[PDB]
Design a protein around this nucleic acid. Structure first.
Lengths: 106, 21
RNA sequence: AGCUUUGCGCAGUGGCAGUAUCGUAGCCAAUGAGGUCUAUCCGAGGCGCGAUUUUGCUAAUUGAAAACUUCCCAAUAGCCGUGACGACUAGUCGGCACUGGCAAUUUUUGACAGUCUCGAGACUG
């Protein structure tokens, strides 16, 4: 368990976006996505010990209604140096995989 | 019996050009 | 008072087919579109252009990798003999240790298994 997933969870929806340039996108994703709707949290997957951006990342959105438009408007849109591919987050943590296992046998 | 074939690393080693044991 | 007709809107439950669905600051059209059975009769859209296999989710496959803040080494975790240490009178006993052994009647490498009768016996191999 990584105590880093408890900063965006506010019943919000986490758009799950890949195809992000390694050399860029440290905060360009936040800059691009701040226009709609307002200030939020946008963080990029950057592994420690190497300073190498793993590319893909999250973005937290207040409302799924706003998320729908954001996805439909930024799906493949040119951000940084690569077009971004957007999908839905999973957050398959222990409290959910236990329920998944319980449902499997049922 | 059979043992996992102990392999080594080629790229991104941060070590000497020669081989470790 | 219930019953009932038509048009429209909203949902639920079913069936059918994907050579067809949709758009029309383009043109023409009940002051008539279109008429190859069918005409002193019939009566509604037609033509041109344009788009084309949505989305969420799930499953399978490819490969080294299909996209989201591990492997390996060393050591630790019963009895009979033997060696010391110790205790008690060459012998006996207790604990510890490890340099051989533990399927041939008294034990720990199996006289067991099947059958039948009303807790108890009989039959067979």
């Amino acid at each position: 368990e990584d105590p880093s997933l408890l900063e965006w969870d506010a019943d919000d929806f986490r758009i799950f976006c890949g195809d992000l340039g390694n050399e860029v996108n440290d905060d360009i994703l936040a800059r691009a996505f701040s226009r709609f709707p307002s200030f939020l949290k946008a963080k990029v997957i950057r592994d420690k010990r190497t300073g190498k951006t793993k590319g893909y990342g999250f973005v937290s959105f207040k409302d799924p209604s706003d998320y729908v438009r954001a996805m439909r408007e930024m799906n493949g849109k040119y951000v940084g140096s690569r077009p971004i591919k957007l999908r839905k987050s999973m957050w398959k943590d222990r409290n959910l995989d236990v329920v998944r296992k319980k449902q499997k046998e049922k | 019996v059979s043992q996992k074939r102990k392999y080594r690393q080629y790229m991104n080693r941060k070590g000497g050009f020669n081989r470790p044991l």
